[model samples]
Target chain A: MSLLAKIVDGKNLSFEEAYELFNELKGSDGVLIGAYLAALQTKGYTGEELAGLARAMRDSAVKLDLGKVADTAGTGGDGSSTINVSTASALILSAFTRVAKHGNVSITSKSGSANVLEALGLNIRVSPERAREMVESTNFTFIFAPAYHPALRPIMPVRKALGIKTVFNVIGPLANPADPAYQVVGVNSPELLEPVAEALEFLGVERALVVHGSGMDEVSPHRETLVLEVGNGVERYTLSPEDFGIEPVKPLPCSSPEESAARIKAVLGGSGRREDRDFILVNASAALYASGVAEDFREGLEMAREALGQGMLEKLEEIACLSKS
Target chain B: MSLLAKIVDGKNLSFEEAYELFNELKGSDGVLIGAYLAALQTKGYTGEELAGLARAMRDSAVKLDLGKVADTAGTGGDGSSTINVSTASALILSAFTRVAKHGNVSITSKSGSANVLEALGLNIRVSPERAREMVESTNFTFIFAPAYHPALRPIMPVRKALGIKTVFNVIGPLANPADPAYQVVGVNSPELLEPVAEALEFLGVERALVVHGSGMDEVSPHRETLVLEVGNGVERYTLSPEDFGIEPVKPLPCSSPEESAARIKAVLGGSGRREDRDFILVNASAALYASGVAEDFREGLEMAREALGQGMLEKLEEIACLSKS
Candidate 1:
């Protein structure tokens, strides 16, 4: 049916439907996806319509339960390429608290949370059951988004070919399979925090810290970040190096995935320079507080520091080895 | 490419595109026509989109010009399945003035103008150029909608299968192949007269008369009819038996296509009783005034009476015969 017809008929599709349509188009030599996307762009898609599509995508794949695990994911494509700080933060939080990390590996940037974690030897593509098993066996599991969200696989080629961010870029984080009750989601811009929070609320999330860094980088460590917390309602705040009792830092410079991966590894190992450690501490604290492992954000900060200073780095290595097995 | 993709790219399809898509669906044991119609009905098509599609249809077929000829066409699924008075009037007006008639017919009722004309052996599939030739040679021609508007064919089977009125029903009449400078259109409702008149103006038509008869029966002969005169702008009036110096008459009852067709034939032959004659005259005057064959509508009414009184019934026969030749 024509997209317009589908809309007019009041038959709403979820994200999975969008993905299915994309997959159908992919199988058809790329015409249907292009047409559907173009028509949707020309005619604005409503949030409700978007919600339907998201539901569809979620339904198309398996949903895993991480059992109160908490971690961070971001709607990346911010056009700035920085180290995967969230990946490092996830590792630290996993050492201290249960963390089920899920995210797109990388589309626009050189490395994503999943990419860095994969490079660290974590098995990211385990089935939803296996993922839950790992989260139970250890305290952490990294869900590779594309593997769980197979609907996205068909359009990957078109997305790669276009080389520009479209709505599909937003779908990854929205379709988390674990359905983690608590989350720290980083967006590219502060404008998205409220809407993303509202969407998470509608999705029945218990608590969520939706963040949009004020800095221009995708994973930039140098700038302050705008954050919105939503549980029963929403509240706004910001975090910076000065806010964390550290001096302001310049934008961390990196040119390749290997460089970024090395920086992320060093931060997780607690052997990185002050800027790297501070960045990881701030995000890891947010994750810790969202996970209910800490009474408040300040205490969460101390917990993150403890995880780093103690043998948590060795535990992250152990989890990664266990995931591979 | 999927239907969604085909629409997105904004490419015009040739007959080959239709044949391929048609055959593909057929090979899968699918109802291509039903699917196409459902898609269109469910997904509303915009005028601009239809215009593009119409252009493709025109490109796939032959076209013609009837020098200085005037004509009218209507999107006829007005929900009131009355006898097609417009068809009869067009045939009658052809006796004294140039008339190029365009229609896409269905068996929604027992008969439509195109259906009756086709049953009468008037070639409904003539090329647009041949239609123009007929207009030039005999001062009248019938342009069957499907032949000239090939793009409509893909959706035709679907529309027929659904058995419901859709926006395409309106678009069909609006997208006339002749692009005639003058026209008389009948809408299903009074509310539509002004909007349709405005559309006629937008199409750059020099003169147009749009009408909608009020009552449960759309073409009920006994009721009052709303008429809109649109060209440079819009003006409205009403027409009834009183306007033609006849007493108010009961609505003529029709049981079948043959009975209705016979009633129409008797009226044009100038031998039917008062109701038939008045009904034909009222609609014929509209055609006459729209065609500019008479200086005023009253004069057009007189011409209509005179033409029927004479042997113009034979003229309709001649035109229908020549269409076959």
Candidate 2:
């Protein structure tokens, strides 16, 4: 059988086999490698294959020393019509827990977290020491993904040329150089939540909750979300706004990067629409529970709402402080 | 669902969808286009998708005006270790029935049919008028595949880059420029015989027999050859040496292309190993029966042996005579 056909169907390759194939592709034809990536992803990658790739990518990521940081980034290509819930949640979580969100400019979405961050004048790049200090001192930092994973640049051309999602998309949120002890990752598609969660679990993440939503694909309290937990032992459950006494509200249509940043600013400073505020609150609550600051997402939700009301959610003030430097 | 997802599952796309997809790929990014090819193939294509692709490819295959010709090319990527039995059968059939064997140099086989014809100095690239003259006058001709289907060249790079079997492999024999009324195509794998036959039936082929040998992946009497008839009401059957009152002979391992050419020469001249001679005779007989030159394969078998004994198969002498010009 051909090497590619080897991994596709019920006959997925062993960990060693997937790792070996990926390693062998290191310096091969990028065009062919891109095609192979698209081929494997088209069939939907197995958890085993994806975990192997995760380990391989992690082996090359420039590791950082961010003590007790939480990386709250959704798999985040959910039609991208939703607000940047994960990034906004990180800002609120930053009021109490450390948030070192490793992220890149968008590929799959119209506007990624970094894209809107740039529009808001957020300084995403810094020296490793400064990146660490930004969170150690201020409770928040964005590790600008490309700055940390040097190996990623080599494969960027190929990824862009293929113009299709690969395992790299799922692994993107997993390969955080910050090594965040806790995580609450939102998946754009339901099929990927379990695998990404498992990869986090395999990486020895102390606690994590991978989630997929029925509405707009974040930790949407507006609709039911399928969640896979990765702490003590893996467990699964569904949650919605009603589960937490937060009334489901109709989410507004999110437009471009500029409009998204405006909504993000409005939500953070307590001037956003109630549903958008609730969406961010729900995701941030999960992040709070993930970082061990709250007992569960319900308590975490109250804490997040109180903190945001107390004017603790101020990403603009912090980045403005960074820009003046 | 994406058009590809439609085919990857049991749900196949319409001929129009697959055709439009291919048309879009033209002048598009090879990186992504290459990936889509790899993706569809990894999931193992279905007969419906293959038929759609065949119809699309045939749509662009600069049609030839061969009034009554037969194409006898195998999906001959079998052990290519096996002798080129289908090509040899075509040569024998050419002495009686018109043969316009549309073929390429080589893709999956050690030596493609066109490759062997070149070794014998047979003119593969004759002018349209010269092509008709050679086949109409001498009852034989080879339509060099690329010379006729200029459209195939655009995608050749992608086919080579993917380096895995795709729908093109199944449709290669079906997209003959000659548009042969009768065909005796050999498939390398048994799983493909029925699909190829069904595609030919869908295309309204007058008569076509798709065969796969258990011994070597072509039409061979040494082992049972699975057969799918496209015309005469689409019958299916298995033919073994026992059917011809010939004992099952242990077939020798076919060697190099040069050795294969020598074997073809021996078989055609009635001076070869009995099994090898019988393998070619059986396939040639099928060609004869397919082209309406004989009543049944059994009767066609007798005619094939008699034709060889009477020195009617003269590809080497005739090509040499033409080359002396």
Candidate 3:
């Protein structure tokens, strides 16, 4: 039966059934994926149902290991054209924590993390095995997400063509190849924070930080951000500029990826404006909490500041050099 | 593109696209149809969307002209093992309205109207021209639904094997070959009454009566039946036993179709109890109202009773004979 019919009949497909569907989709260029993704969004996807699909998609991909890694991604399009805050924070956090960070950094915007990282000297196409080695040897790794999740390539064209965020957009985070134990996800909107957190908890994620920043930019100068901290238990909290002991400054105006990328580099260099510094520290603290290095946001913020103050720029450079070698 | 994809995208297929989908379905003995149907249902189908699909399906079929006819069918399989109320009612109504009928007789059930009609010596495989001729010549016709809606045949096997109501089950009555200006459709549940009415309206049907009996029996006895009446304007109303000046009787207990058929014939032959007569009259009135042969239910009931009393049974026999020839 067709996947749509099977689901409408209220019959849940087993893993094998799901695997067969993915295999069928693999043969199809992307027509089926586009149709199915549209249908799923129109019909709505539950966490359990989405989890099943995530598993099926992961099954279709070449599994990779980063050895006790942690990474973050969002479920849907965050309409805000913010700089790649999560990607930058991930690189900085790798300095203090035992993290093998992986990210799907395609250019949803002009400069996604992968785009900026590519702009830099880092080769994002290392084999999963080499990636694992990079993580094991240096306690840090960056998996350019598309290499492992090739099924998304065909669908990406359609996704970009449609220019609409469907359930598949949100599902990328949940389908990480490494199946990282710790995750820091950024949702497009505040409304999705709880639902995404519940999904992560349902997926048995050990620790997850689901965040969404409000205002014009998706990762805009942290005017306000909603955070769902999920681990042994789930809790909801908010973070703002003042939370990082930085005064609220006027929102940074970003016109293009180059501008955003410049802001990202400055933030990573630890000499950016209060808005950039606060944004990085807040997200880094979320990563610190997600990594189990901090008991709470306050502690996580302290740890994040230390990591930033201790020359994270040199650590990033070191990891980038090692990744190339 | 595959019919599955076209439908999933919720875009209307052109005649060529419809034919392509039909050809694709024909290639696989229903593997494509089954999978597509299941997938679309899980994905969800709106009335307008399904109407577009029904139009596509009709475009794929050999069109026929029955010269201004009305047909009464149902989105069958109310999930009740009750005797086929629409079947018996169709036979009775044909006597008065002389309208050609089409039905997806129960392959899943032990006895469907098409099955019993075949049992009654009507040739079920009449071609589109012959079926139309039969209707024009004898003032009545019956096209076995699956024959004309060949696209449905592929999905039938999967539907039967799965043994549940898929979205295609609801698509049948909506895909009538005559494109009958008037129709009576009985849905399995109240939730479908509005949707089925909307679909019929979207299909350009001029007059339609869509009903859902509140109880488990396909025929209502214990409670009010939900009804959606669509013609120049749409209106909703309910009918109960008390509305017809008849006491609610305990529903009949029939062990088989033969028993139910016998009970139905006895009732029509004027030798049955008041409940049987009332049930037949209620449905027959609806059929008459839908066919535009009567101004209202009261007038329709009078016509129904007169047609039964005036040896219209002979007309039924003649139409069945002509359909076979």
Candidate 4:
């Protein structure tokens, strides 16, 4: 039977099989590509299967030589309609760590990291050299996904036409072309927390935190956030807002990229809603812990608060200004 | 969420939704088409869904006004590698009733009805008028599927590329352009027996037998054949070879269309393997009973034997000769 046939029969494709499928998917027309992905989507891909596909995508993606960077990209299909939590966290993480945040314009959320960054007057489409320079000089840069993975261009329309989550949704966060040393990867569903962490490990990450809150992809301020910490070894744990000395609160919603950018700026400038600011603090702390910039979530929380109190607004402005220069 | 998304989520599409999907599928490119189909395949379509798709294909197909025809077209994916039992049965059934067989060139079986008939020197492709004339004078005609359902042209490659049983496989037998009042529809899997029979009744089939014999799509002489009879009311029963006074035996296999054609000829000429001839008798009897020419399987069997004894070879030559003229 053909790969599509095997998939329709509800059998999991082997890692090597999935890898070849993704490669063949690169050359396929929209329908077969859609069919292949949809079939696998229906089959509910495994972590090993995801690793194989991610490996294919990464192997073909244009690589940037940014050293010792951390990414705060997540598979954003939570339907939380939440503001750009990971993007805001990335901006704050820049105060103490190198952040090469990779993402596309939103397909599910109101605004993706790239969308909000662009709305904030930052150049999301910088050259690899410029991107590396921005990360080196400012400790932050937005890596526009399409610019790095041109091979994924053909399937973009198919994915859009499908108007739903596919293998691309899960693999997007894992295929960062910068090859970041550490990542704060958030999944939309709790079911994906362990599998995505396993996949990240299979792809050989140095250190990372795979997270899913009650409803959001980022660490939640509203409820317990499940975490799979990846380092020298893998471990599982859950953290509540109280764990980091924060009170539980609902995540703020954004209706557009501009709105999301405004909310992000308010948080960084110390003038945001407490709920929004607190959510960002929790997520930024997770990134800090993942990157080893802080010893624990509590230490990371203190560092994040200090960064917010210090010059987060100035840092965002500096990165935006340098990308144009 | 889009229709494709709903399918990937394992939701059954409404009949109207599937009908629109089929129409939209007509205009879609290969990959999107493949994706839509593969997604549905992975979801495992419902019988009502199959009827909706069959209705769509049938509504768009060029129709033949042949009066009160009976079809011996099965959804051919049995992987039995058996000879053209349905085609041979149709040939024998033709001596007693008007038979308008609908089919494509084989995709799974060694030879489709069209393939075997072509090998037997019948022009598989015929004008609707010629098909009508052939059915009227000779009691049989092969309605070349692509010729009638031109709308299905674009998805052919998409279906072929997927190389699996899809909605098209189930709908193909149900969408006979002649709108055959009675059909002997065989399925490759027992799971399909009830649903396909339900779908046939939903499509308003006058009387039909939706059958799956142990493994083959035809009424099996090898073991008990499951049958779902559709008429004024639907009924389910099992028919063993013993029920029809024929001893159970292994079915004959063929390696190619030519081999299938030769085996078909041997059966028609009464020089075939007993296993092959007996299988044809059992199935033709069902068609005979379905078309109301025989009251039961035994009577249908007796009629089939008498037809074979009396000039089955002549009837084959006459139709083949008439089609050429």
Identify the candidate with maximal TM-score.
4
Candidate 2 residue-wise lDDT, A182-203, digit = tens: 9987777887876777778777
Query: Candidate 2 docking: what grade?
Result: acceptable
Q: TM-score of the candidate numbered 2?
A: 0.93
> Model 2 misses residue A162 by how many Å?
4.2
lDDT of 2 at A197: 74
TM-score of chain A of 2: 0.91
- Candidate 1's error at A212, in angstroms? 5.1
Residue A256: error of model 1 in Å? 6.5
The i-RMS of every model, in angstroms, reads 8.9, 4.0, 7.2, 1.8
True contacts kept of 4: 0.84
How much of the true A–B contact set does each candidate keep? 0.08, 0.52, 0.18, 0.84
Candidate 4 lDDT tens digits, A139-214: 9988888888888888888887777688788899988888888999888898888778888888889999999898
TM-score of chain A of 1: 0.84
Alpha-carbon lDDT, every model: 0.63, 0.73, 0.66, 0.85
| TM-score-better candidate, 1 vs 2 | 2
Looking at model 2, residue A317 earns an lDDT score of 73
Q: Residue-wise lDDT of candidate 3 within A1-325, one digit each (tens)?
A: 2674555655655645655665665565344454455445445445555566667676766777556678855543555455566766777667766565555634364656666676555787888777877777566777666787787766666555434456566667777777778998887766566657776876678888888777422333447777777876898887776765556654454566577666777777767767767666777777877888878666777777776643766776767787788
lDDT per residue (tens digit) for residues B122-190 in model 2: 666776677777776677777776777676676788777766666676777877767789998778787
Winner by DockQ between candidate 4 and candidate 3: 4
